[PDB]
């Protein structure tokens, strides 16, 4: 029979039955499953430092963002994009293709076709759950202990005075695997005193670090996560073969394969310069990048006044509402550019979510 996996070390965010204000630090903020009091109750240590207990039966206060640190894996599978084998963590199987699967990183990282609907297969014992397409679903940003975050020592600190003392600060440079069997479970820190080392952020449910300034850790499809209990769209190899004399390849750039970058530079070397939320600048061949997007916060845009097309465009992105009718032809301001490249536009006082093709720059 099916049973619950008490996956200690799972990286979680708030769930559908959440009623605990901003204990987590807000929606999208990430925490670590420390332990299970019972099959009904779980204790989480949030990245902000607050440790608390939550429901994981009947009511569900938590969604699983990344189970990979628990080491749970689907032997006999492979992610057809990044070629992780076996898939560790949640398994995502394209329902509309023959024998195609993605890992969590690639799934939330918008690999494969966004209009193809996937099955979620959380555990080896799980029955597959058909989902809405990513393209019509809400995407939000993870926040907490990620590259660029400012941290202090956490509760499970057992590393003497490597940080120069309790309360002394450092910078997370990169999320790494504490071990081969537990990916995305560690954070490499460069302390303010020049010391540097790798620390547990999820491994065996341990929390060696605490945020004092959380960082963005990429975007995810919130409603596709199971309840607990500048862009690159080419193959790694095609990207590598294109970089032969236009920047080159170092593994430290892997982030780029699933992260939105801000084109802040061009250069004399017939190439491009991109910065990422990590804080990393990196150089590229023109063919490796695709725009996404052509708008900036503050840009004034006119809403499309062809109703047929805006209906098509908005429905295609799961954002149509008849209430939007009065906005046709109107000029508004780009308030925010979402991770799925849709635009939060302020128009007629109110704000709406638009397909970027449904507006034109004024």
């Amino acid at each position: 029979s099916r049973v619950m996996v008490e996956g200690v070390g799972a990286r979680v965010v708030r769930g559908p039955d959440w009623k605990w204000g901003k204990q987590d630090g807000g929606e999208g903020h990430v925490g670590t499953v420390r332990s299970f009091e019972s099959p009904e109750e779980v204790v989480v240590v949030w990245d902000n430092g607050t440790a608390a207990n939550y429901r994981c039966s009947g009511a569900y206060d938590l969604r699983i963002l990344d189970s990979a640190p628990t080491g749970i894996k689907h032997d006999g599978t492979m992610c057809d994009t990044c070629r992780q084998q076996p898939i560790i963590g949640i398994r995502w199987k394209c329902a509309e293709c023959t024998n195609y699967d993605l890992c969590t990183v690639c799934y939330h990282g918008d690999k494969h076709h966004l209009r193809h609907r996937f099955y979620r297969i959380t555990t080896p014992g799980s029955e597959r759950v058909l989902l809405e397409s990513r393209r019509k679903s809400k995407k939000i940003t993870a926040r907490g202990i990620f590259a660029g975050a400012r941290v202090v020592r956490g509760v499970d600190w057992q590393w003497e005075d490597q940080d120069g003392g309790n309360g002394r600060r450092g910078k997370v440079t990169e999320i790494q695997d504490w071990s081969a069997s537990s990916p995305h479970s560690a954070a490499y820190v460069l302390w303010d005193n020049g010391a540097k080392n790798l620390y547990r952020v999820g491994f065996e449910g341990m929390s060696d670090l605490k945020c004092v300034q959380d960082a963005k850790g990429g975007s995810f499809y919130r409603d596709h996560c199971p309840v607990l209990g500048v862009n690159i769209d080419l193959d790694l190899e095609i990207v590598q073969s294109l970089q032969h004399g236009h920047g080159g390849w170092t593994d430290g750039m892997f982030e780029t394969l699933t992260t939105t970058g801000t084109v802040c530079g061009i250069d004399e070397d017939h190439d491009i310069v991109v910065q990422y939320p990590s804080g990393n600048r990196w150089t590229f061949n023109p063919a490796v990048l695709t725009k996404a997007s052509q708008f900036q916060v503050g840009d004034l845009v006119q809403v499309c006044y062809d109703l047929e097309r805006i209906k098509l465009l908005q429905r295609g992105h799961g954002e149509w509402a008849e209430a939007m009718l009065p906005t046709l032809g109107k000029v508004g301001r780009v308030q925010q550019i979402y991770s799925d490249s849709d635009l939060k536009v302020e128009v007629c006082g109110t704000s709406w979510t638009y397909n970027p093709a449904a507006v034109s720059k004024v």
């Binding site: 605990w20 430092g49 607050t50 440790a51 608390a52 207990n53 939550y54 429901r55 009511a59």
Partner: peptide, 7 residues
């Protein structure tokens, strides 16, 4: 900041 919830 250890918090204890009850339900």
């Amino acid at each position: 900041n250890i918090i204890k919830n009850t339900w």
